Amino acid sequence: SQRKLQQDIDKLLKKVKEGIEDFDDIYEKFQSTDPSNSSHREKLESDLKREIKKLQKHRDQIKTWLSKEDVKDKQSVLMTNRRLIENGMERFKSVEKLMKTKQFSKEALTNP
Amino acid sequence: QKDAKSSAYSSRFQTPFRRRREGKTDYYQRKRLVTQHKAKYNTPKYRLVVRFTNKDIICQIISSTITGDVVLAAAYSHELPRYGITHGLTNWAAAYATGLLIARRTLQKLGLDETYKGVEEVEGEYELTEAVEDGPRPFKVFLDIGLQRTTTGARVFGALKGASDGGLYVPHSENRFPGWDFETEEIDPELLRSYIFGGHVSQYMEELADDDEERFSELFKGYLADDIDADSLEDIYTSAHEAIRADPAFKPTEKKFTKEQYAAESKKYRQTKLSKEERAARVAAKIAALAGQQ
Amino acid sequence: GKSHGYRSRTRYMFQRDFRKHGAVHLSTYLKVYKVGDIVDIKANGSIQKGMPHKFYQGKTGVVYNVTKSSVGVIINKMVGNRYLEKRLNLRVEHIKHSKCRQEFLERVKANAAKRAEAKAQGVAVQLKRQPAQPRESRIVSTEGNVPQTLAPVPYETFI
Amino acid sequence: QNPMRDLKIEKLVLNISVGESGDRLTRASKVLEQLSGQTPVQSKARYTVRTFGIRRNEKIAVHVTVRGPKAEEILERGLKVKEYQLRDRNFSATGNFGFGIDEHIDLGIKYDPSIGIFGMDFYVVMNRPGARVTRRKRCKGTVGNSHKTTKEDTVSWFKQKYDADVLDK
Amino acid sequence: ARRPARCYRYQKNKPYPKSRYNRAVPDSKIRIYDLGKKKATVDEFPLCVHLVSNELEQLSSEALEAARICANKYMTTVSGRDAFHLRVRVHPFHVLRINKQGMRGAWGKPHGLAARVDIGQIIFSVRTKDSNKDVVVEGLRRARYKFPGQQKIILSKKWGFTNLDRPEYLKKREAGEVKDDGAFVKFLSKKGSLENNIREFPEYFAAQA
RNA sequence: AGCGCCGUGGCGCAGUGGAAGCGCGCAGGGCUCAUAACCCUGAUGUCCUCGGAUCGAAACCGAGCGGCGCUACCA
RNA sequence: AAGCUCGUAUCAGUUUUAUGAGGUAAAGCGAAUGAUUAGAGGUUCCGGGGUCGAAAUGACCUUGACCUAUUCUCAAACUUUAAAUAUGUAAGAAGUCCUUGUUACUUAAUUGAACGUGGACAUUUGAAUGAAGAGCUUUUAGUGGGCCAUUUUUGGUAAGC
RNA sequence: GAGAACAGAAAUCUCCAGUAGAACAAAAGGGUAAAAGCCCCCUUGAUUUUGAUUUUCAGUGUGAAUACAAACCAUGAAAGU
RNA sequence: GGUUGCGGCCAUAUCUACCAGAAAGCACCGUUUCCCGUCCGAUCAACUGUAGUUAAGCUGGUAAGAGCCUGACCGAGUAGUGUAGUGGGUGACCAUACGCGAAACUCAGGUGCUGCAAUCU
Numbered sequence A: 001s002q003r004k005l006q007q008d009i010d011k012l013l014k015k016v017k018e019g020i021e022d023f024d025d026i027y028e029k030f031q032s033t034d035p036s037n038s039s040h041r042e043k044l045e046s047d048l049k050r051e052i053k054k055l056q057k058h059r060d061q062i063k064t065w066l067s068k069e070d071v072k073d074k075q076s077v078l079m080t081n082r083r084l085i086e087n088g089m090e091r092f093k094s095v096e097k098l099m100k101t102k103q104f105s106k107e108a109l110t111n112p
Numbered sequence B: 001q002k003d004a005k006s007s008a009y010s011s012r013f014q015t016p017f018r019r020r021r022e023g024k025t026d027y028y029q030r031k032r033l034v035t036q037h038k039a040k041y042n043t044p045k046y047r048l049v050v051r052f053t054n055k056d057i058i059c060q061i062i063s064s065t066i067t068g069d070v071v072l073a074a075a076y077s078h079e080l081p082r083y084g085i086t087h088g089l090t091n092w093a094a095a096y097a098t099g100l101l102i103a104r105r106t107l108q109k110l111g112l113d114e115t116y117k118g119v120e121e122v123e124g125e126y127e128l129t130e131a132v133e134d135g136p137r138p139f140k141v142f143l144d145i146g147l148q149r150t151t152t153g154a155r156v157f158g159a160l161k162g163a164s165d166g167g168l169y170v171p172h173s174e175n176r177f178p179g180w181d182f183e184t185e186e187i188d189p190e191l192l193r194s195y196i197f198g199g200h201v202s203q204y205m206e207e208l209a210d211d212d213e214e215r216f217s218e219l220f221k222g223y224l225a226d227d228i229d230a231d232s233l234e235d236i237y238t239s240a241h242e243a244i245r246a247d248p249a250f251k252p253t254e255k256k257f258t259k260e261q262y263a264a265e266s267k268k269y270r271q272t273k274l275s276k277e278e279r280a281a282r283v284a285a286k287i288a289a290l291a292g293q294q
Numbered sequence C: 001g002k003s004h005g006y007r008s009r010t011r012y013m014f015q016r017d018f019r020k021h022g023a024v025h026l027s028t029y030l031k032v033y034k035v036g037d038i039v040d041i042k043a044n045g046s047i048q049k050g051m052p053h054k055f056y057q058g059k060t061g062v063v064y065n066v067t068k069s070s071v072g073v074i075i076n077k078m079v080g081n082r083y084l085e086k087r088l089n090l091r092v093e094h095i096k097h098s099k100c101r102q103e104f105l106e107r108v109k110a111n112a113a114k115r116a117e118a119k120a121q122g123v124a125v126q127l128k129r130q131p132a133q134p135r136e137s138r139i140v141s142t143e144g145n146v147p148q149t150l151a152p153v154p155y156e157t158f159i
Numbered sequence D: 001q002n003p004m005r006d007l008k009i010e011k012l013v014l015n016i017s018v019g020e021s022g023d024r025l026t027r028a029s030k031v032l033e034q035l036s037g038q039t040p041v042q043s044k045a046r047y048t049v050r051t052f053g054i055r056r057n058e059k060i061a062v063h064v065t066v067r068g069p070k071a072e073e074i075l076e077r078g079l080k081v082k083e084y085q086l087r088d089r090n091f092s093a094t095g096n097f098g099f100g101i102d103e104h105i106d107l108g109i110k111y112d113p114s115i116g117i118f119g120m121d122f123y124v125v126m127n128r129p130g131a132r133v134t135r136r137k138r139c140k141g142t143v144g145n146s147h148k149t150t151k152e153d154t155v156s157w158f159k160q161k162y163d164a165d166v167l168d169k
Numbered sequence E: 001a002r003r004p005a006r007c008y009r010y011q012k013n014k015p016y017p018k019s020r021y022n023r024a025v026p027d028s029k030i031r032i033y034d035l036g037k038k039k040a041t042v043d044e045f046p047l048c049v050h051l052v053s054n055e056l057e058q059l060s061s062e063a064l065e066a067a068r069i070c071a072n073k074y075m076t077t078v079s080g081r082d083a084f085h086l087r088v089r090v091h092p093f094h095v096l097r098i099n100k101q102g103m104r105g106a107w108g109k110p111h112g113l114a115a116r117v118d119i120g121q122i123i124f125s126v127r128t129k130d131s132n133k134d135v136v137v138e139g140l141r142r143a144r145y146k147f148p149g150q151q152k153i154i155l156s157k158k159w160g161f162t163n164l165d166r167p168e169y170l171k172k173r174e175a176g177e178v179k180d181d182g183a184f185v186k187f188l189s190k191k192g193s194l195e196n197n198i199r200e201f202p203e204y205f206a207a208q209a
Numbered sequence F: 001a002g003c004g005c006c007g008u009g010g011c012g013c014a015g016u017g018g019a020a021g022c023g024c025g026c027a028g029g030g031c032u033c034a035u036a037a038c039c040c041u042g043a044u045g046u047c048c049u050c051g052g053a054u055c056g057a058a059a060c061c062g063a064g065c066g067g068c069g070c071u072a073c074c075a
Numbered sequence G: 001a002a003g004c005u006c007g008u009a010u011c012a013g014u015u016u017u018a019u020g021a022g023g024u025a026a027a028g029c030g031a032a033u034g035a036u037u038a039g040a041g042g043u044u045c046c047g048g049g050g051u052c053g054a055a056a057u058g059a060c061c062u063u064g065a066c067c068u069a070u071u072c073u074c075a076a077a078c079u080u081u082a083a084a085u086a087u088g089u090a091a092g093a094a095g096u097c098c099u100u101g102u103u104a105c106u107u108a109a110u111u112g113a114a115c116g117u118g119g120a121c122a123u124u125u126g127a128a129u130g131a132a133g134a135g136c137u138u139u140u141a142g143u144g145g146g147c148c149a150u151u152u153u154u155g156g157u158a159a160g161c
Numbered sequence H: 001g002a003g004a005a006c007a008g009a010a011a012u013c014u015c016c017a018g019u020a021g022a023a024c025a026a027a028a029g030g031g032u033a034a035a036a037g038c039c040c041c042c043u044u045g046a047u048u049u050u051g052a053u054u055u056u057c058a059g060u061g062u063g064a065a066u067a068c069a070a071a072c073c074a075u076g077a078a079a080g081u
Numbered sequence I: 001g002g003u004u005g006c007g008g009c010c011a012u013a014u015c016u017a018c019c020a021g022a023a024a025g026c027a028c029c030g031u032u033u034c035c036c037g038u039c040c041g042a043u044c045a046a047c048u049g050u051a052g053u054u055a056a057g058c059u060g061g062u063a064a065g066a067g068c069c070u071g072a073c074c075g076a077g078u079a080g081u082g083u084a085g086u087g088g089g090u091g092a093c094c095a096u097a098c099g100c101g102a103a104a105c106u107c108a109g110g111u112g113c114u115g116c117a118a119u120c121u
């Protein structure tokens, strides 16, 4: 039923918002790690990786909803939460690549 | 070259119309020209057809009929030297004189000659032939250029200005006459008038006579043969204009060696077709010639 | 699921003829229709403006109104238990004259003529058409034509 | 016979395809300016190729068309830097021919240190008097079968003229 | 599986071929259509023998392949492989359908492929010499059993597969207007070009025997 | 049978039109008497197949292959 | 059912003559699109193999494609062509011809358009057959589950589906 | 198809053949070649006032469309649209 | 009757390969000051009809030409079809009666006609 559908909508909406909040908190603690604590750097990577994976599952559910499920009113808020999840994805990708890159690997030797 | 086209292609091929196939008419333009408002039922749409060959200017008044187009008046640049122009039959001055001649000829034929005198004080100014109150409306024709480009400063627009100054009501704008500077978006009456009496040909004559003698002689051997100096061009063109205003009547040629002699003696040179027995005789002769496995 | 559009089931109806595509010609542009005439409606697919419906394709009517580029045609159509009069606005590309009507005009001109000399010399008007009357007594010549005798052929298979 | 059906160079096309846009293409357009003495036209791509590094609607090449005595003298300088030997490939089947030169300082202007090296394509089309019948607007047509320059006609024009030679085939 | 030809026998539906509207159909089981010495000439094989239909029905691609196999096996075991040329003259282009709750949505999936045969239509053609008339007749008699309905052997008096009854074809050959192509012949027509007619039939345009 | 999901490196998985990565494995060097652990590096893909849209995709849209999960109720 | 206006040239579930329109059946594929069988002749500065080979815009053979001329079979959502049956219109008096009146429309224009005045036209008033009256209006009942047979035809193996 | 340095299967240029085998926003079917396609120039008629007509049809509505009339405009040399 | 301008029907007119074309007319052609348009006076614009050439265009003819068109008692009254039967046949389907009636195939013939005006040995 449409009422049950919209209830599940609002539930995943709230879960996405709280996930975005704690992902942003882990991100800002990462940027203020004090990078001498490399173990703390790696721990915050793994934590925001877990949170961004949860956001991956939520975003795939949003994909299926906007594709087939006849959301019928709230395509705006579904698309905005999709965009918030994807900018979180690219932030995670930049951070993850940044600590992946080895200081004398061929890519860093080609272009700084 | 092994690019011979297949029987299926030739069978599915739709040929164009005749005049399109020999590339002489635009049927889109012709349809929009000759389609009449159907609430008039009989009124032909008259076309001032203007055509330019390499050595002649053809200017006709044509109406459209189911059996084919019919003409009402014709004027020819090779008939202009009867009036006044023995040299320069495809210049913009001969185009203007031909348009003036066709306008005067068709109004004289129609009987609208006592009114709509035209201008008679040609000055290179753009005006439309206003309808005389309490009288017949001016004769309305539409310019048929055909296929040439509608660029500014064209001899077809010269014949247009010639018919307009004659007295034919052809609707037109002034943004195609020479001297229309688009930066200023007006017309140049002095430049138009100078080119009416052929100032361009004149200044070319004096520029060549100043600079290059061999070139001037080569391009104007006829002018030097007639001893026409470089500054009588306006005089001879004017005298041509009032000759047009004087006698706009079609005088045919003397027509020597008459039409039956033309049909009989001029051409026995068209090679006649053969018949079935002659074609079979040629086929059998070719079989006899190609007999054997050689 | 089910569609009834303006040009539904009009595929071969609004196709052009084979090797007759392209521009339509100036004969059907220059023919003149006056008020009260009788015309045949057959749509031309190249001109999309002013097309008739598929019902009026191949339909004969009376033109009652003429305007700038179109004519108005009166068509009687059967809906229910009555005929309804329909006023179509059709372009002259889709409108064509009636050769039956022109043949009626040549017949009435011929009839007026025939009654004129019939009155001039005073016998045998006989204007109205008669149907195909039974054939009359004739004589056939056997001279040069002896009747050759025919028989049914036997059954031979050709395959 | 040969009244006035004599082969003449219709036009000569100078084409430089730099492959990218900006500084190099501007300098190549400049090269065409001092070579031809005539404004060049910049040709645009048609679609994207990943390997070529080109993009659709991105200005790729630049060419000039010259005609007459200027085309003749540019053609003479091109044959002089090609040492008057051309290939039977290098002579197309519709009679038109062409070649390609590298390091254009071999003819004409010096290097002009702000411009650079630009190799370039010479292509030359040959026509007999009377190609207006297929190029004009009113009453178009196609040239006859004793026309349409062939490979044989052009190769002979280049051998009768210019004292030039060809290769194996 | 394997529903009978008795329920796929008559022509009840419109022809339903493989097209862009009907995809994912199974392939036919008959893949070879000519058999024996298929590179022979009509010079070599004068007598034609036709297995023709008498009923407006549908022939399975299975029935075609089974009849072709049994006929082939009989002629090769009796008269050898090069003594005949057998061509099957019907191609299975009919996608038969199978239904496989209730009659709701009853439009069925593709199941087969059938040759719709008309009355008087050739099913099998065998061209052979004049001495093998017996063996080609009994091979086509085996073919008549694997094929449903009523069929006939007609001794076709056309020279080979082509056309043109035997005296007419003999006259054409001795006139020389017949050229031997691969497994067929080309004919001289009086409508072509003289030059290419000369270079393709030299014997008619010469005084040869 | 219907519906839905999944198919990406050797394995488990991410991946949004400018376009292929994570971890463990694998390879080379180092450290060690030696092997793990550790340090410095490198390589790795028919993106299930086929076709299409697009200037272009693994992504978009369609056909099949393979593997899962849900429903199959009232008598 | 009540009728009403006329019985005064009106209409036919019909035919003929004339003129249209159609894209089904059939037919066709050495005609376009798509499918499809088999050989033949060729072409590789340009598919994959081998051989003579150092290779060669070299050579020989094998197999794939591309072209040419043929061949076998097909198409509800292919088609050049194209029926039969059904289908529109016309067969006049509200018609035709001649002359000249209106207009603010139209034409270069007493030029046309539409409507007219006044004359002419008949033996049949312009094919056949039949008319049982023709036309018109108002009001209201019941019905709005259908089924069968020939023929055409869709789904289904089929069905008293 | 035949050619031209890098440049090859595909970059750009040139010629020839090319009845449309391309393109026309999208489904499919029609239509279109000096165009209805591609490029360029100018524009806002995708405007105002209500009527008549066609399709669906009860000859109701909605939607869509057609042909005009009265204006005001755009474009074009103009007919026109 | 040829040619030109404007056309009607729109292949009997198209396509391929050759040959011919007196006169005139078209055409190719010669030139860049002006109006004008281009990367390029090639197209377009303007000027001259002069320097020349029928080489092309165009026109006509030829080809057991392709195609297209017309006709046939050529196929064929065949396929198909309207109506009828307490006709046949298990059926599929098929004959008959009264009517209509093709297409491909084959063969034969043909390869633009014409209107208004102007001009031409």
Ligand SMILES: C[NH+](C)c1cc(NC(=O)CNC(C)(C)C)c(O)c2c1C[C@H]1C[C@H]3[C@H]([NH+](C)C)C(O)=C(C(N)=O)C(=O)[C@@]3(O)C(O)=C1C2=O
Pocket: G008, G009, G010
């Ligand atoms: C022969 N008569 C009985 C007749 C019959 C019909 N209609 C029919 O044919 C019958 N209609 C059927 C076929 C039954 C449906 C008719 O329709 C007529 C007439 C009579 C005419 C008489 C006409 C006449 N003039 C002018 C010729 C006349 O004297 C007058 C008058 N000046 O008043 C008329 O009334 C007259 O014009 C007339 O009305 C007649 C008919 O209409």
Ligand SMILES: C[NH+](C)c1cc(NC(=O)CNC(C)(C)C)c(O)c2c1C[C@H]1C[C@H]3[C@H]([NH+](C)C)C(O)=C(C(N)=O)C(=O)[C@@]3(O)C(O)=C1C2=O
Pocket: G009, G093, G094, G122, G125
């Ligand atoms: C076809 N016949 C039957 C006929 C029909 C109509 N009516 C119509 O067709 C009406 N037109 C419609 C269909 C309404 C538009 C008719 O109106 C007439 C006629 C006949 C004529 C006969 C004339 C004749 N005159 C010329 C001598 C005649 O015999 C007489 C007479 N003296 O009795 C007439 O009545 C006659 O003059 C006449 O009036 C006829 C008609 O009016």
Ligand SMILES: [Mg+2]
Pocket: B029
């Ligand atoms: Mg135009």
Ligand SMILES: [Mg+2]
Pocket: C012, C013, C015, C016
């Ligand atoms: Mg049609």
Ligand SMILES: [Mg+2]
Pocket: none
């Ligand atoms: Mg529209």
Ligand SMILES: [Mg+2]
Pocket: none
């Ligand atoms: Mg290691």
Ligand SMILES: [Mg+2]
Pocket: none
């Ligand atoms: Mg170790």
Ligand SMILES: [Mg+2]
Pocket: G008
């Ligand atoms: Mg009365």
Ligand SMILES: [Mg+2]
Pocket: none
């Ligand atoms: Mg009829």
Ligand SMILES: [Mg+2]
Pocket: none
């Ligand atoms: Mg249909």
Ligand SMILES: [Mg+2]
Pocket: none
């Ligand atoms: Mg059929």
Ligand SMILES: [Mg+2]
Pocket: G027, G028, G081, I103, I104
């Ligand atoms: Mg057919």
Ligand SMILES: [Mg+2]
Pocket: G029
């Ligand atoms: Mg086909």
Ligand SMILES: [Mg+2]
Pocket: G093
């Ligand atoms: Mg009366």
Ligand SMILES: [Mg+2]
Pocket: none
């Ligand atoms: Mg009721």
Ligand SMILES: [Mg+2]
Pocket: none
């Ligand atoms: Mg009711």
